[PDB]
Amino acid sequence: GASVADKADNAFMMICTALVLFMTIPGIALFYGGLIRGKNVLSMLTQVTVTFALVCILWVVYGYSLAFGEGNNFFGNINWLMLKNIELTAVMGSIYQYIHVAFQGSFACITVGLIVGALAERIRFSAVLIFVVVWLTLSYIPIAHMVWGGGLLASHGALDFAGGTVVHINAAIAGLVGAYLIGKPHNLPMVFTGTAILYIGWFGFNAGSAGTANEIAALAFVNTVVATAAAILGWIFGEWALRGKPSLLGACSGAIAGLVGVTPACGYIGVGGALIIGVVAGLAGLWGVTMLKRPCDVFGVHGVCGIVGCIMTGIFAASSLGGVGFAEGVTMGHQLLVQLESIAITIVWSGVVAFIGYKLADLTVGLRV
Amino acid sequence: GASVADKADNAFMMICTALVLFMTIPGIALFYGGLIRGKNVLSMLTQVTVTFALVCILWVVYGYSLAFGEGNNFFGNINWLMLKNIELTAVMGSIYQYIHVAFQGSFACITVGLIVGALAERIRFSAVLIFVVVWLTLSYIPIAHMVWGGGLLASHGALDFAGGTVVHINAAIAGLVGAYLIGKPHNLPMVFTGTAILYIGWFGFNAGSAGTANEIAALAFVNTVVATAAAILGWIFGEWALRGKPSLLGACSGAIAGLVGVTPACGYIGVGGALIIGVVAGLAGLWGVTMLKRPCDVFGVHGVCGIVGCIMTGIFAASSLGGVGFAEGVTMGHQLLVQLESIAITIVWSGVVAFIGYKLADLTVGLRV
Amino acid sequence: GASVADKADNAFMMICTALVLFMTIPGIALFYGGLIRGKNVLSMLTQVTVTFALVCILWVVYGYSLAFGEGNNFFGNINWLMLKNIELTAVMGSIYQYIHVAFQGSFACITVGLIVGALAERIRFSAVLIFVVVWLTLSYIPIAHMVWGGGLLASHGALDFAGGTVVHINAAIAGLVGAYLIGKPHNLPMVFTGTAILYIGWFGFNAGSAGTANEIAALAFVNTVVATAAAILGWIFGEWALRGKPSLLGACSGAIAGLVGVTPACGYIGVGGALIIGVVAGLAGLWGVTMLKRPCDVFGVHGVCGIVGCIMTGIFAASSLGGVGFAEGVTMGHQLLVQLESIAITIVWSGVVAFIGYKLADLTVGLRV
Numbered sequence A, B, C: 001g002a003s004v005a006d007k008a009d010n011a012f013m014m015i016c017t018a019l020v021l022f023m024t025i026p027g028i029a030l031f032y033g034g035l036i037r038g039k040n041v042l043s044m045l046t047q048v049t050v051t052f053a054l055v056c057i058l059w060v061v062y063g064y065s066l067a068f069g070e071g072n073n074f075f076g077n078i079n080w081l082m083l084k085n086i087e088l089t090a091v092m093g094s095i096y097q098y099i100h101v102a103f104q105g106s107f108a109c110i111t112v113g114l115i116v117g118a119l120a121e122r123i124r125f126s127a128v129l130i131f132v133v134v135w136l137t138l139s140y141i142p143i144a145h146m147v148w149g150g151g152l153l154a155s156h157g158a159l160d161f162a163g164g165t166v167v168h169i170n171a172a173i174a175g176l177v178g179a180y181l182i183g184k185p186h187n188l189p190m191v192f193t194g195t196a197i198l199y200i201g202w203f204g205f206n207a208g209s210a211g212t213a214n215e216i217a218a219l220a221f222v223n224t225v226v227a228t229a230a231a232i233l234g235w236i237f238g239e240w241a242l243r244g245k246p247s248l249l250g251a252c253s254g255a256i257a258g259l260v261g262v263t264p265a266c267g268y269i270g271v272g273g274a275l276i277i278g279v280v281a282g283l284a285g286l287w288g289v290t291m292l293k294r295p296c297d298v299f300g301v302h303g304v305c306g307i308v309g310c311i312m313t314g315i316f317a318a319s320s321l322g323g324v325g326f327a328e329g330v331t332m333g334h335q336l337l338v339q340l341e342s343i344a345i346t347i348v349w350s351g352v353v354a355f356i357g358y359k360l361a362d363l364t365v366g367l368r369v
């Protein structure tokens, strides 16, 4: 008579959650650790660790409730504060809701990790803490609600499997604003290791977004492998033609470009589409960081490849191109408009909230160190 | 007619086992590697690796049989030597017994890893090998039998989900004795990475102790996230008030304090209780290392937070506080006495056996390098 | 009416796949990174990353089809190019075929990683790329087809659970030829970390080769723990007797020796046999690297222990020795001949194809840097 959780899905989603947490601790920390100067590594690792703990607490206190509760088109409710009224045996989809809480919580953590790790070098410890609380509550939570919580964008049929908008575009804009309001790689092997951990954990990230160990999770898994590989080759060959020599940083940057690009598309497109998305994202990323020259720059990779991925998702979702197919009565032209709407709303929403958070921190404690 | 294993539980427990092994190799090794001097790192990594291999062999030869066989209140039997009389399709709980062997074996490995890694710098290679064999056989095995093998403490209704006594208190005392009989951080990023690996693997540690991918595993997972985060914040804010500035080492120490503290409680208490246990363990740990000043010190974190966690487990297990509830006919007052008994017996048992092991090594090969 | 995938097996195999990918990124990269000179680390990491991406693409384009399609005794077909004609819900064994694609793809990646990482220091970037394409297509693919694709060796009843021939012997010969045609450890902690990651990922490697979370996967898991531990002890004690002192490199080398040795045997033999295989492989490996002195040398460990493991697999598979038992009508003498045939064919096949690949690269771009 009651809902039943699937233990295979339980097992899969719990492990995926650990993999996503792995992306932050120590994944994204080691990544930025090798990029920034050695004199700021220790301070950066501290901020990433402390803000990570902050997000975890805020998420269970009110974060999850406002993101996945009901709710309007933008915000949920406050009936799941400290996970109250959530039975231990409550089922969300085919898993226990508690697992759903932890999984989506790890998504919030890595999103914040992307921002903090890239500007911890330049932002006061007190300031970044203030920014996190504001931006998480007023940007990440409602955007996650719009796309995954049955909000505005979800009701328009937006296609974002693992968070092209919710995570990558959302954080890229927030980081770009911060880098603006305040404006050599120390250890490349450390960058490689961070990239490596990010890649491995990204499988929990992408395939876990299926919420079950099924054929869609399988599709997202293979598409993550293919797009990442195609983006590595796409970047380094573009780099080998441009500057006449491949680099380790270029190879790692290419991998991230593909992971970001396939993030909204992995569970919607075919393997052929994944290879195309990979190559394009790899080239678009390489074009992005060079055109930006005319870890502040990685927000160019996350931004561009995120936008590219969301757009190409609206194309290669079509059954004709090997995708899973658009919803009933939806054409490619209509879907692309919805993708563009999702991108536009996310950029505006994040930019405004980020600005407010940074400004608020600047007036209370100041941003400069 | 015969017992059947659950493949979802099989899959989950095998992955959890790998995660616990991950805590030792290379988790705890990288952790102590960044703490101790650089001139002793190579020797320490060797001892940790060799003793790890030693425990693995001893465990399957007689370790598992004496720990989970039957048995009296303190020791099992010797009918499962080299896993003899254990059918390949034998089921322990809802998984194949072979998986149960490997999982509990990884618990023995990390427990020994906690000890060896912290005093490899000061103890002769020949001496630590002698100590491991003695202490594993006469301390870890019977204590594991008392709590998890249906021994003395288990029959009193002791609440220890993932090893507040069996692992943390047991090893802390053993390490404290050793540090007594023989009595600057080299790489903080290495400490952070070790802490990171320990944290990720700890999910297999805590949630895996449920023995199945169910709502209890889900509860332990979320409680591990919450308590760790609350302990990080608890430590650094206590540190920020005390010495006027947060540190990377403090953040990492806080994470370990919460992981240790929630270890016996994760599958018994509520999320609210987990946050409280986290904050308290974080503060108790910070108080511990400073009061100890008036990797020898980490045995203060493991000891104190382990004791604190076991005690607070007897409190927040109550249904009134959001816990899963005490056994039928058990009051909070009675449960706390059982918790205290478990702590007392473990401290005495470990201290005596550790002393004998160290003394025996001192008379045969000598402890000093 | 149609075939159904098992979600527990789906979950298990997807996680195992991630663990095998973990062995390459960053596992094998960090391993060779600490071995070779510091001036070649960055270039080596780049080649490993780029060739990894190359294998991933080649595998889905035609690699999987030619390896597991049908097919003759040596090659499959080309009806699964870009995974065409493979329904998303298609089932291979008890999992979705897409998962089977990714899992076997990760095996191809780590095999190539073993080769590239060991001679990236000495081989031109353009040359190794040419070699990979040739060797993967004409050596790895048909050998994998012979053993796992229902080819020649599989029809003779060859026992190779996780790739004693397909991976280890195959790559060792290819690397040995390369080292011949072109013919101090930088960071031992980096070697240890690489060894650690390889070990953890190896559980997905060995236990995943069961294709399901069953008692055979459980057996392979425990045997991986036991053989690795026994080989660590076997190596260092042989080293402690020979040179009078154990080393970190020796401990790590021992671990790899056991992992390699138990690779073809893990799902076929008993725990007692695993301990024997471990000790023997550990000693055979130590003997190998010293006799080779009268990361070029690791191909001695992979070669010897691979051969030893394949042979001892034909012995300890017997029910009398605790194994799962030979096929109906197969004696130990007959099985050993089949093992020897598998080893002989693999060595010859790989050596010829490797030679052609290296020569072809030498005539087009040249091998020397």
Ligand SMILES: CCCCCCCC/C=C/CCCCCCCC(=O)OC[C@H](COP(=O)(O)OC[C@@H](COP(=O)(O)OC[C@H](COC(C)=O)OC(=O)CCCCCCC/C=C/CCCCCCCC)OC(=O)CCCC1=C2C(C)=CC(C)=[N+]2[B-](F)(F)n2c(C)cc(C)c21)OC(=O)CCCCCCC/C=C/CCCCCCCC
Binding pocket: A072, A073, A074, A075, A138, A152, A155, A156, A157, A337, A338, A340, A341, A344, A345, A348, A349, A352, A353
């Ligand atoms: C070429 C050059 C140009 C390129 C660059 C373009 C630049 C940007 C372009 C953006 C283009 C995107 C356009 C916006 C969204 C349209 C959605 C819509 O209107 O569809 C109606 C229908 C339901 O109807 P309804 O509106 O009644 O319900 C939803 C309504 C109430 O929500 P409620 O739950 O009650 O919450 C109560 C409360 C109050 O809420 C607010 C926000 O005050 O909520 C809070 O708590 C408030 C939140 C509290 C926040 C707390 C702090 C955080 C603050 C952050 C700051 C953010 C800054 C602003 C962000 C921008 C958001 C728009 O919520 C709204 O507000 C709606 C917007 C109003 C409005 C309109 C309208 C009505 C008709 C039209 C034409 N427009 B509009 F002109 F497009 N328009 C614009 C431009 C801006 C607005 C506000 C606006 O939708 C549904 O649910 C689903 C059913 C429909 C079936 C599927 C087919 C659909 C298919 C759509 C395809 C679209 C293709 C476009 C392509 C774009 C190409 C780039």
Ligand SMILES: CCCCCCCC/C=C/CCCCCCCC(=O)OC[C@H](COP(=O)(O)OC[C@@H](COP(=O)(O)OC[C@H](COC(C)=O)OC(=O)CCCCCCC/C=C/CCCCCCCC)OC(=O)CCCC1=C2C(C)=CC(C)=[N+]2[B-](F)(F)n2c(C)cc(C)c21)OC(=O)CCCCCCC/C=C/CCCCCCCC
Binding pocket: B072, B073, B074, B075, B138, B152, B155, B156, B157, B337, B338, B340, B341, B344, B345, B348, B349, B352, B353
């Ligand atoms: C304020 C200041 C003070 C603060 C500091 C306090 C300091 C420390 C306090 C400790 C307080 C903890 C008290 C000890 C445990 C009591 C358990 C008990 O007695 O309960 C009986 C009942 C079953 O009855 P039974 O005793 O017949 O069976 C069990 C019996 C035989 O085992 P067996 O399987 O046959 O093995 C055969 C063989 C021989 O064994 C031994 C050990 O020689 O086993 C070996 O191989 C031997 C092992 C081989 C080892 C090999 C080398 C390794 C060596 C290690 C060295 C270790 C050093 C010593 C360790 C200390 C252990 C106590 O095993 C025993 O020995 C029992 C102990 C005897 C004894 C008693 C008794 C009888 C009654 C009383 C009152 N006491 B006692 F005075 F408390 N007491 C003390 C103080 C010490 C002892 C020995 C002792 O239990 C059951 O099974 C379950 C059924 C009951 C239903 C649930 C409700 C229960 C609820 C209990 C709540 C308690 C609350 C206390 C609060 C504490 C607050 C801090």
Ligand SMILES: CCCCCCCC/C=C/CCCCCCCC(=O)OC[C@H](COP(=O)(O)OC[C@@H](COP(=O)(O)OC[C@H](COC(C)=O)OC(=O)CCCCCCC/C=C/CCCCCCCC)OC(=O)CCCC1=C2C(C)=CC(C)=[N+]2[B-](F)(F)n2c(C)cc(C)c21)OC(=O)CCCCCCC/C=C/CCCCCCCC
Binding pocket: C072, C073, C074, C075, C138, C152, C155, C156, C157, C337, C338, C340, C341, C344, C345, C348, C349, C352, C353
């Ligand atoms: C002490 C000192 C010595 C120590 C050192 C020893 C040194 C090396 C020893 C090696 C010893 C290993 C011996 C080889 C394999 C025997 C298998 C066999 O012959 O069994 C028959 C039966 C089916 O019959 P059939 O042959 O008709 O079918 C298979 C046949 C056709 O395949 P097809 O699908 O049509 O593909 C079409 C096409 C063409 O193919 C080829 C390759 O041109 O495929 C391509 O695309 C071609 C591939 C395209 C490649 C593209 C580029 C890649 C190039 C790589 C270069 C590789 C170099 C060469 C590699 C060596 C391979 C042998 O494929 C063949 O070619 C077969 C080989 C021919 C031959 C024979 C024969 C017939 C009888 C005998 C006795 N021999 B033979 F003398 F042993 N022999 C040798 C020595 C060499 C050859 C070629 C050879 O098998 C089955 O299927 C199963 C049914 C049987 C039931 C289970 C009980 C079995 C039990 C066997 C136990 C054996 C124990 C030996 C112990 C060894 C101890 C060390």
